[PDB]
């Protein structure tokens, strides 16, 4: 198709960022309602950090990025996982691979 250039490319990018931001927030909002409904364990980063390493060997030090990565993964990507102990096994698997 026709390549978007200049102002059109920039505006498409801007609007697409808005769309994806809304989708990003919505995925988490909906997942939290469903989680409450089924009794999924409340996300607790500190309890998580007891049973596995979320540090990526000290590269990930921002507390805001760190909670946001794992809370979102827990709720949005693994909706059928009910416990942080379960999720721990997942996280460990993730850092066993590139």
């Amino acid at each position: 198709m026709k390549t978007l250039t200049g102002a059109d490319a920039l505006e498409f990018h801007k609007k697409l960022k808005e769309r994806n931001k809304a989708l990003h927030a919505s995925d988490l909002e909906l997942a939290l309602v469903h989680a409450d409904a089924v009794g999924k364990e409340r996300f607790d980063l500190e309890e998580l950090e007891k049973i596995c390493d979320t540090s990526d060997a000290g590269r990930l030090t921002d507390a805001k990025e760190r909670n946001d990565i794992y809370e979102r993964m827990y709720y949005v990507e693994y909706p059928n996982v009910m416990t942080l102990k379960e999720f721990a096994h997942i996280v460990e698997t993730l850092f066993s691979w590139s």
């Binding site: 390549t3 990018h13 994806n20 469903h34 990565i69 698997t93 993730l94 590139s98």
Partner: protein
């Protein structure tokens, strides 16, 4: 198997396995002497290969550059590097592909342990290989060529998240390197069948399902953040995003080149900047005759079609999750 090589070859009271266990092991002297020697040998080899790459690139007129190949597992990254980065293709030819920053390049050697056969699994050697990659990257930071110029380097990692992207941009800025970034996307299912096609006798990784899916989600969700860095700073370098058409061929989707931002394929751009999540799973989808036929229907190349077919048939009747799990467990 189960015990990691960092535990087997580490010396003494090993710190509880999160970091703290890294600085301990980041010190090249908390390892058994034989393992220390293996590390030195592998780092020497990798450094030699990296210097060959750097001298090739400089001879071909490339200013000091960090070539970053972003993208999820088995998305076609190697073919894109070969075809779409001609100066780097010329360099990689001279090293048979070696010299890039990537923990996976050390895995085969660590797994064989100079014994002549693989006796440790990829997972068993991963921590150790990551440690070696970090030492390798550390030494490359201020590595010079024969002209005294900073060596160009290649980072071949998923590079999904903001912190990782920021770290490499910072490394480039601090060392006076441009960032030349190619970002390569394929549908999740393409990565899954890509992994099943990788044979254990090869050196490409065969991760389990959660690695490929979480990698897919991360790479897509953070893609526009990466693009924003290049839109904001023309001096950073250049960015190209390649996505996968229905027939499996890679096409340019968006780019920031010489500071100019363009969207070559708006439909794909909308698609490949989002993970396509729902509240509740491709993991449970069963590889059946239909699925194999469905994937074969969009593969026209005979060799690729045959290999895709054979990889899937081996796991006929299993879910994607079960299939990748079994495939990953092979040594």
């Amino acid at each position: 198997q189960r015990k990691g090589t960092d535990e087997i070859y580490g010396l003494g009271s090993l710190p509880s396995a999160g970091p703290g266990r890294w600085e301990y092991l980041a010190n090249p002297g908390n390892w058994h002497p034989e393992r220390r020697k293996l590390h030195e040998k592998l780092l020497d080899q990798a450094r030699s290969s990296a210097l060959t790459l750097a001298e090739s690139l400089e001879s071909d007129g490339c200013q000091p550059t960090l070539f970053a190949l972003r993208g999820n597992t088995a998305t076609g990254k190697t073919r894109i590097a070969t075809k779409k980065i001609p100066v780097l293709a010329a360099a990689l030819k001279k090293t048979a592909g070696k010299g890039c920053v990537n923990p996976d390049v050390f895995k085969s050697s660590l797994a064989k342990s100079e014994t002549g056969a693989k006796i440790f699994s990829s997972a068993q050697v991963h921590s150790e290989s990551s440690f070696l990659a970090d030492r390798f990257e550390g030494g490359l930071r201020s590595q010079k060529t024969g002209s005294g110029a900073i060596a160009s380097i290649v980072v071949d990692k998923r590079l999904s998240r903001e912190y990782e992207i920021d770290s490499y941009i910072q490394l480039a800025k601090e060392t006076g390197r441009k960032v030349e970034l190619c970002d390569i996307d394929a549908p999740l299912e393409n990565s899954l069948v890509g992994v099943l096609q990788r044979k254990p006798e090869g050196e490409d990784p065969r991760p389990p399902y959660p690695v490929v899916s979480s990698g897919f989600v991360a790479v897509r969700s953070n893609r526009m953040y990466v693009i924003d860095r290049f839109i904001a700073d023309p001096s950073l370098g250049n960015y190209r995003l390649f996505g996968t058409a229905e027939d499996g061929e890679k096409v340019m989707v968006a780019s920031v080149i010489g500071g100019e931002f363009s969207v070559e394929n708006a439909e794909l751009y909308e698609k490949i900047t989002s993970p396509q999540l729902s509240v509740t799973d491709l993991a449970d989808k069963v590889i059946d005759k239909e699925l194999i036929d469905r994937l074969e229907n969009n593969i026209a190349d005979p060799e690729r079609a045959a290999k895709t077919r054979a990889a899937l048939e081996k796991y006929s009747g299993k879910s994607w999750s079960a299939a990748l799990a079994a495939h990953s467990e092979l040594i």
